Ligand binder design. Structure first.
Ligand SMILES: O=C(O)[C@H]1O[C@@H](O[C@H]2[C@H](O)[C@H](O)[C@H](O)O[C@@H]2C(=O)O)[C@@H](O)[C@@H](O)[C@@H]1O
Length: 264
């Protein structure tokens, strides 16, 4: 039933420019495993990363709080260039995500992240693609998440946007500040599909973050405050809930560099 994603033409392009980071839910190493660090995914099939032969879905699957199975796209890109927009396209079906979160500990821990724009560190700093370095702050620019319930909305996708470039980590000395208390916009994108897939396109460039869902722009947000941070894409599952396992089927996942975003 399970095959190597590298065998499937529709995923080959994105995999050539990615590595896989995958937690080991019962491993005792305490740091995630990493694979295809050279962008070569031949032979890679795991419980947490495979193609389902029948549907040809790329499956990311992961038990346990804060664990993840995700590809990390190589390019550390600048978000402030005119006419250069970095684009992550995905067509996904989350698999019974309400079941995944059903045994969680508290209402806030009821989320699953599918797509991210994270920072690698400063545009000022000389470190290569594919890794992180000086200037890194421990917050992604945006996560597209499923949330079971928020603000009366049940089973919607949300964009969790970091709305400043401040380090608000536990060792920052900043957690009490206004910037840190008010650091995020959490904005509702669309309910999860009743049937079929949900199509996402993220464009980052020209000092903008654009997020489309089913070809309709849901987020169109100036990100000039982030433009000192080299940024990069991740896609898969990453768990903000306890005591279960998440699963997402990606029927398409693409990465490209465009002269302009699609705004509609
Ligand atoms: O749950 C929280 O205390 C805050 O989480 C923040 O998102 C975290 C996220 O859960 C992962 O740890 C992540 O990738 O790092 C994130 C970050 O932005 O630092 C935000 O959701 C924040 O609103 C929460 O209060």
């Amino acid at each position: 039933d399970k095959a190597a994603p590298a065998d499937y033409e529709q995923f080959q392009d994105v995999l050539k420019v990615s590595k896989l980071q995958a937690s080991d839910p019962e491993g005792k190493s305490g740091n995630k495993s990493e694979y295809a660090l050279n962008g070569e995914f031949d032979g890679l099939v795991l419980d947490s990363f495979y193609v389902d032969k029948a549907s040809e879905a790329l499956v990311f699957k992961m038990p346990g709080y804060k664990n993840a199975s995700e590809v990390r796209i190589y390019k550390n890109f600048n978000v402030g260039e005119a006419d250069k927009y970095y684009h992550l396209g995905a067509e996904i079906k989350p698999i019974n995500p309400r079941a995944s979160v059903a045994n969680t500990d508290k209402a806030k821990n009821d989320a699953i992240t599918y797509l991210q724009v994270h920072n690698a560190g400063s545009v000022s700093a000389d470190f290569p693609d594919g890794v992180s370095g000086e200037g890194y702050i421990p917050h992604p620019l945006v996560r597209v998440v499923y949330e079971a319930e928020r603000s009366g909305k049940n089973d919607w996708y949300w964009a969790v946007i970091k709305n400043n470039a401040v380090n608000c980590g536990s060792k920052s000395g900043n957690k009490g500040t206004e910037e840190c208390k008010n650091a995020y916009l959490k904005l509702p994108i669309a309910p999860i599909a009743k049937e079929g897939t949900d199509k996402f396109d993220i464009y980052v460039g020209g000092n903008k973050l654009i997020i489309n869902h089913n070809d309709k722009t849901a987020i169109n947000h100036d990100i000039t405050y982030w433009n000192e941070k080299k940024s990069y894409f991740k896609a898969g599952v990453y768990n903000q809930f306890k005591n279960g396992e998440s699963e997402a089927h990606f029927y398409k996942l693409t990465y490209s560099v465009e002269s302009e975003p699609v705004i509609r």
